[PDB]
Design a protein around this ligand. Structure first.
Ligand code: HEM
Ligand SMILES: [K+]
Length: 405
């Protein structure tokens, strides 16, 4: 999709780059978008790709857009038109001050006591999935761990049956990274019809699970409604069934080629929260579509109320104005500075789940399987987009390297 140039843009800004096809399908998503940070490039570009849209290159503007909600809004963070004409989800798309009620119900929908009874069952769940791979000398880590594990936890959290997993992951993959004749409206329509029977059942039949919470919690002196419940749930399931599934896989595509770091995670299992937040920096994976509230002036051009700009978090995790070591990766630097988790205007409700399933992955894979490499004659192809993925991750290992844990 390529568009002719709107002559209110002056050309010296213009850059060739698509969000689903970044500079090179053979690199990692951070190293595929890095060409936008060369020392001649402005803080923001117009791309004629995808039908036309503004991108920021620099972490520094991204972190300033992110501060004040009155100047820029997350209210639809999904920029291509198809998502832009059909995305509308709670708490994100609800106006404040009441929005902060839904945020606290969501905060408790995502509460750990309902899964914390289950910690040894969830630790079994990891072992179950690795112990199906371990003596075989190979896996394909997307399908063989990363889809199963965090989804099967989120299916405990929501009371959802595991036979639904091919359904809901198809939907959270078409919304983030499209291909077929299902539009975003169609994805949303089909997820909202899947959700409604489950919601109105919990309404008569509440039990311990997040969907029973999101079907019955109180907000501003009234209960939540089923149409609010289905609208929170969509975004929440695009969290737990996409953001964390892709993050696991890029975290091990890294470790597979790196036999120094796999020792680092077993010399200091304690330090893993540093490493985890370093991997969050180093594979920052999101590009979000910030909404203009009012106005914005830069380099003689001006933006309008209702307009928007794409903020690559893959380049927020990379700007040498904010981030001390851009490509370089070591587990022992102090807290990151970017926006791949929120700032002033909005904030991530759920990355605590994802970063836990990482901090748990970074133990229960390692403890069993400390040495591993991508299969010979294979190659990896990353899948950039508004939230990014990978095509597959086919790994190998000598299996007598391992021990039963
Ligand atoms: C580590 C993996 C993940 C990353 C990096 C990530 C990152 C983010 C980012 C950057 C935002 C936008 C913040 C803003 O607009 O300022 C977002 C929002 C959100 N996240 Fe996460 N997230 C992840 C995992 C999760 C999970 C597992 C869930 C599911 C519960 C989730 C639920 C949400 C919700 C509900 C929003 C909307 C927040 C709001 O309106 O302010 N995220 N996330
Ligand atoms: K809206």
């Amino acid at each position: 999709n390529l568009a002719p140039l709107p002559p209110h843009v002056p050309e010296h800004l213009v850059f060739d780059f698509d969000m689903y096809n970044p500079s090179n399908l053979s690199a990692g998503v951070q190293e595929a978008w890095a060409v936008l940070q060369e020392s001649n490039v402005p803080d923001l570009v117009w791309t004629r790709c995808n039908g036309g849209h503004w991108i920021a290159t620099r972490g520094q503007l991204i972190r300033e857009a992110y501060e004040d909600y009155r100047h820029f809004s997350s209210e639809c963070p999904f920029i291509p038109r198809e998502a832009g004409e059909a995305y509308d989800f709670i708490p994100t798309s609800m106006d404040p001050p009441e929005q902060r009620q839904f945020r606290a119900l969501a905060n408790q929908v995502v509460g750990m006591p309902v899964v914390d009874k289950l910690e040894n069952r969830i630790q079994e769940l990891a072992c179950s999935l690795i112990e199906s791979l371990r003596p075989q000398g190979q896996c394909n880590f997307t399908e063989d761990y990363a889809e199963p594990f965090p989804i099967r936890i989120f299916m405990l959290l929501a009371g959802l049956p595991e036979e639904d997993i091919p359904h809901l992951k198809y939907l959270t993959d078409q919304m983030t990274r499209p291909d077929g004749s299902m539009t975003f409206a169609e994805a949303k329509e089909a997820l909202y019809d899947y959700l409604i029977p489950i919601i109105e059942q919990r309404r008569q039949k509440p039990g311990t699970d997040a969907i029973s919470i999101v079907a019955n919690g109180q907000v501003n002196g009234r209960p939540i409604t089923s149409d609010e419940a289905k609208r929170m749930c969509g975004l929440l399931l695009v969290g737990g069934l996409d953001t964390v599934v892709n993050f696991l896989s890029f975290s091990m595509e890294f470790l597979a080629k790196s036999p120094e770091h796999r020792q680092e995670l077993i010399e200091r299992p304690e330090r893993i929260p540093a490493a985890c937040e370093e991997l969050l920096r180093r594979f920052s994976l999101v590009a979000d579509g910030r909404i203009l509230t009012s106005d914005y002036e830069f380099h003689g051009v001006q933006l309008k109320k209702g307009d928007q700009i794409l903020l690559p978090q893959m380049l927020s995790g990379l700007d040498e104005r904010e981030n001390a070591c851009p490509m370089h990766v070591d587990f022992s630097r102090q807290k990151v500075s970017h926006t791949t988790f929120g700032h002033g205007s909005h904030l991530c409700l759920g990355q605590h789940l994802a970063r836990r399933e990482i901090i748990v992955t970074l133990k229960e894979w390692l403890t069993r399987i400390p040495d591993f490499s991508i299969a010979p004659g294979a190659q990896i192809q990353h899948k950039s987009g508004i939230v990014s993925g990978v095509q597959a991750l086919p790994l190998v290992w000598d299996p007598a390297t391992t021990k039963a844990v």
